[PDB]
């Protein structure tokens, strides 16, 4: 299943070079994973209270083309792997013409926020995903 | 109580206009207040031990001239008022050529790291800055 | 003429205190002003074509209550004063319960995109508002 | 090896009580910028050379978190140089030298204005 999430580029996301700052795309990717979860009725604010959180363990991003001020982007997200305490997201960012701006592979681990120690993915989440 | 804090402008702080993003200055001011408090041994750790955190209640910023990529700036901070649960910080930012770029007045209140509700200023703070 | 803009709070907007970092609200306010102008067809592209840009000259924000991860906020924006070379925006942010989180008064000046010197507001903008 | 200190402020943390993962990415960039300054290549000097750098590929591995007020050290080294690109090997450690995360960054040299790939000026090549 492919989840899509729109993102408008504002001045806060750009840098003096005249394009989106590379670390801003990282944040866009996080927003997209969060919205995918929300689509399945899961709230990370609520989950933290149950001592369930998600942290990035490894992330690789390859950049191909820039995004500029006011561009409306689309973040595409897919879960390609699910294991005991982790899952692998495959994501990409494209613009209004579907030009591939960049892509990423993100290894996310489920953890108990208080001890920051890995824990098995909740069954309720696995069931939906 | 004048405290100076140097700050280098990096790409993360700039925007497509070729200058520092107006909200980035707000972050710079926060660092300077944090560092001035640290200068008086009021590190986050020390504050937490006193069951205290600071929240901005009101802030007015005047934008005069822009900071650019790689400029080394100096944030200047002073505490000009201390009453009840409130602290008033007066800050300004200048560049290497000493040009005035920005100025701010910040009213901050004291709260307990839990309820996030205002509380009286710890005895140590008033004693240190009065 | 009250323009409303929804904004979702993500991890990037929060801080260790468990609430939204105060500077994040400043960015939210900027997005809302940008979107109000867009609503009237004054996109960044349209403004550059008019040879004008808007810069914040003086801004005040008063904070009352906090926002947290996953909260859907509403930024309310209006031009409370239009002058020959400047605009005063009155803005406020409320949560889903309509509780006032914070409010702002923003003086923005019209300038030439090149020299960044003051410039009169284009007649198209004057006519529109 | 170039070392760059970085203090963690509220702006760098998130509601989880640790540094937001994208913040480390920004820290790595500052470190690269400072390493270049140390080798006589400040942004001014780079503009004079008509050079700007763009991240082409980046892999970061996260091992342990940093928290509010921690003083970190970013370690940076250029491990490869080829035509129009450079590979940076970096890592972030805390005051006890515990390894928090590490990254490999492939950067490409481009013209500031057009941002199109261009051979690394001999001024920089002859530097590293």
Curated annotation (Swiss-Prot), chains A, C:
Function: Thioesterase that appears to be involved in phospholipid metabolism. Some specific acyl-ACPs could be physiological substrates. Displays acyl-CoA thioesterase activity on malonyl-CoA in vitro, catalyzing the hydrolysis of the thioester bond.
Membrane-protein topology: Peripheral membrane protein
Similarity field: Belongs to the 4-hydroxybenzoyl-CoA thioesterase family.
Enzyme class: hydrolase
PANTHER family noted in UniProt: 4-HYDROXYBENZOYL-COA THIOESTERASE FAMILY MEMBER, ACYL-COA THIOESTER HYDROLASE YBGC
Record's subcellular location: Cell inner membrane
Active site, UniProt feature: 15
Gene3D superfamilies: Hotdog Thioesterase
Predominant place of localization: membrane
GO biological process: lipid metabolic process
Protein name: Acyl-CoA thioester hydrolase YbgC
SUPFAM superfamilies according to UniProt: Thioesterase/thiol ester dehydrase-isomerase
Organism, as annotated: Escherichia coli (strain K12)
Classification of source organism: Bacteria, Pseudomonadati, Pseudomonadota, Gammaproteobacteria, Enterobacterales
């Amino acid at each position: 299943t492919l989840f899509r999430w729109p993102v408008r580029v504002y001045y806060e996301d750009t840098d003096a070079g005249g394009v989106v700052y590379h670390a801003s795309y990282v944040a866009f990717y996080e927003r997209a994973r969060t919205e995918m979860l929300r689509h399945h009725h899961f709230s990370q604010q609520a989950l933290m209270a149950e001592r369930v959180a998600f942290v990035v363990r490894k992330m690789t991003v390859e950049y191909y083309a820039p995004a500029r001020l006011d561009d409306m982007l689309e973040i595409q997200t897919e879960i390609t792997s699910m294991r005991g305490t982790s899952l692998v997201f495959t994501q990409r960012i494209v613009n209004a013409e579907n030009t591939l701006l960049n892509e990423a592979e993100v290894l996310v681990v489920c953890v108990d926020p208080l001890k920051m120690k890995p824990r098995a993915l909740p069954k309720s989440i696995v069931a939906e995903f």
